[PDB]
Design a protein around this ligand. Structure first.
Ligand SMILES: O=c1cc(Br)ccn1CCO
Length: 129
């Protein structure tokens, strides 16, 4: 896309060691699946396109971007070593939204609905085996 958007977060890197865990499997099959199909998922399914949105300050403010399209690729392409790395990606995505936008803006209400679901699912993250 535009040269004025940063490159997306890394989803491929052979030098980074990879592992499947049961918790990572749950993150894809339960957590990502649940949030991706939610009515309010669409703004979170790809990197913020600051050019298309006319938000030229977005990447001035948000220096650690994350989105569910990136997370989906990371899960499907086994990028992670553990569940904490992926959970941190989700939390980064939510916090970016809460930092950039005014409380009570529609996008914040959308994020909060996804976060409530996320929390419920992560409370049930299975014991690592
Ligand atoms: O902050 C966010 C978060 C998502 Br998810 C989409 C767009 N923006 C910018 C405001 O529209």
């Amino acid at each position: 896309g535009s040269h004025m958007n940063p490159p997306p977060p890394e989803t491929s890197n052979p030098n980074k060691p990879k592992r499947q865990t049961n918790q990572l499997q749950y993150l894809l099959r339960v957590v990502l699946k649940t949030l991706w199909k939610h009515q309010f998922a669409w703004p979170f399914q790809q990197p913020v396109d600051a050019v298309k949105l006319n938000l030229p300050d977005y990447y001035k403010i948000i220096k650690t971007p994350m989105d569910m399209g990136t997370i989906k690729k990371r899960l499907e392409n086994n990028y992670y070593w553990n569940a904490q790395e992926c959970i941190q990606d989700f939390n980064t995505m939510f916090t970016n939204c809460y930092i950039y936008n005014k409380p009570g803006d529609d996008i914040v209400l959308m994020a909060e609905a996804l976060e409530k679901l996320f929390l419920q699912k992560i409370n049930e993250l299975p014991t690592e085996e």
